[PDB]
From Swiss-Prot:
Modification Phosphoserine occurs at: S148
UniProt domain PDZ: residue ranges: 12-101, 108-201
Organismal lineage: Eukaryota, Metazoa, Chordata, Craniata, Vertebrata
Natural source organism: Homo sapiens
Post-translational modification: Ubiquitinated; targeted for UBE3A-dependent multiubiquitination in the presence of high-risk HPV E6 proteins and degraded. Palmitoylated. Could be depalmitoylated by LYPLA1 and/or LYPLA2. Palmitoylation of SCRIB by ZDHHC7 is required for its localization to cell-cell junctions, function in the establishement of epithelial cell polarity and the regulation of downstream signaling pathways important for epithelial cell differentiation.
Gene behind this protein: SCRIB
Region of interest: Interaction with tick-borne encephalitis virus RNA-directed RNA polymerase NS5: 113-125
Disease listed for this protein: Neural tube defects: Congenital malformations of the central nervous system and adjacent structures related to defective neural tube closure during the first trimester of pregnancy. Failure of neural tube closure can occur at any level of the embryonic axis. Common NTD forms include anencephaly, myelomeningocele and spina bifida, which result from the failure of fusion in the cranial and spinal region of the neural tube. NTDs have a multifactorial etiology encompassing both genetic and environmental components.
Assembly behavior: Interacts with UBE3A. Interacts with PAK1 and PAK2. Interacts (via PDZ domains) with VANGL2. Interacts (via PDZ domains) with LPP and TRIP6; the interaction is direct. Interacts (via PDZ domains) with TJP2. Interacts (via PDZ domains) with APC; may mediate APC targeting to adherens junctions of epithelial cells. Interacts (via PDZ domains) with TSHR; regulates TSHR trafficking and function. Interacts with ARHGEF7 and GIT1; interacts directly with ARHGEF7. Interacts with CTNNB1. Interacts with MAPK12. Interacts (via PDZ domains 1 and 3) with MCC. Interacts with DLG5. (Microbial infection) Interacts (via fourth PDZ domain) with tick-borne encephalitis virus RNA-directed RNA polymerase NS5; this interaction targets viral NS5 to the cell membrane periphery and nucleus and prevents STAT1 phosphorylation, and thus, the activation of the JAK-STAT signaling pathway. Interacts with HPV E6. Interacts with influenza A virus protein NS1; the interaction results in the translocation of SCRIB from the cell membrane to perinuclear puncta.
Residues of the full protein shown: 993 to 1193 of 1655
Record's function text: Scaffold protein involved in different aspects of polarized cell differentiation regulating epithelial and neuronal morphogenesis and T-cell polarization. Via its interaction with CRTAM, required for the late phase polarization of a subset of CD4+ T-cells, which in turn regulates TCR-mediated proliferation and IFNG and IL22 production. Plays a role in cell directional movement, cell orientation, cell sheet organization and Golgi complex polarization at the cell migration front. Promotes epithelial cell layer barrier function via maintaining cell-cell adhesion.
Family according to the record: Belongs to the LAP (LRR and PDZ) protein family.
Name the record gives this protein: Protein scribble homolog
Tissue spec: Expressed in kidney, skeletal muscles, liver, lung, breast, intestine, placenta and skin mainly in epithelial cells (at protein level).
Subcellular location(s) of the protein: Cell membrane; Cell junction; Cell junction, Adherens junction; Cell projection, Lamellipodium
Length: 201
């Protein structure tokens, strides 16, 4: 019946469709791992909400679990099925969402890299090579494994071993392999903007 035994509030949020973009990003599905949004129970989650965007104005937050889209159950829908349902022409986009909490210790860190200075960290994970979380093998998250005092992260001090990496310079690492994440972390300029939450501290 899809209502409403959860400890988190379930709300039906409508988004006006007047030609503009949704201004939201989703992760998860029936074929995608959604850590750290779906640990106990997997599903479709909103990973990113653009500021001053349509979703932001409507009241959508990061970490919201999408239960239904215009009446259609999307709890066990494919990622592409969720996308198609959101981008589907309708008078009013109705979203049944549950207010699941945002990832623990979610914070955006900015790190300055001096000229000729490396970042000085090693990462573990993630997709197609799950190893980042040895305690939770099913997790394809990307974690910081080592932190060198010589690098920019050591001079910063905010990065520590165990933190989960979510975004690197406005690019989600969710679903990416180890090599793809390394490549993104190497291709950054003198400024590293990373979305970080707690991992296996
Ligand atoms: Cl619109
Ligand atoms: Cl529209
Ligand atoms: Cl490095």
């Amino acid at each position: 019946a899809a209502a409403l035994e959860g400890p988190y509030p379930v709300e039906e949020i409508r988004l006006p469709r007047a030609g503009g973009p949704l201004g939201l990003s989703i992760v998860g599905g029936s074929d995608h791992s959604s850590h750290p949004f779906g640990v106990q129970e997997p599903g479709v989650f909103i990973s990113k909400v653009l500021p001053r965007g349509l979703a932001a104005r409507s009241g959508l937050r990061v970490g919201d679990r999408i239960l239904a889209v215009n009446g259609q159950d999307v709890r066990d829908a494919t990622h592409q099925e969720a996308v198609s349902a959101l981008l589907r022409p309708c008078l009013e986009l109705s979203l049944l969402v549950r207010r699941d909490p945002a990832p623990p210790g979610l914070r955006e860190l900015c790190i300055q890299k001096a000229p000729g200075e490396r970042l000085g960290i090693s990462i573990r994970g993630g997709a197609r090579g799950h190893a980042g979380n040895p305690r939770d093998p099913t997790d394809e998250g990307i974690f910081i494994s080592k932190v060198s005092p010589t690098g920019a992260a050591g001079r910063d001090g905010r990065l520590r071993v165990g933190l989960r990496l979510l975004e690197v310079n406005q690019q989600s690492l969710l679903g990416l392999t180890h090599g793809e994440a390394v490549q993104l972390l190497r291709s950054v300029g003198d400024t590293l903007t990373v979305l970080v939450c707690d991992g296996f501290e």
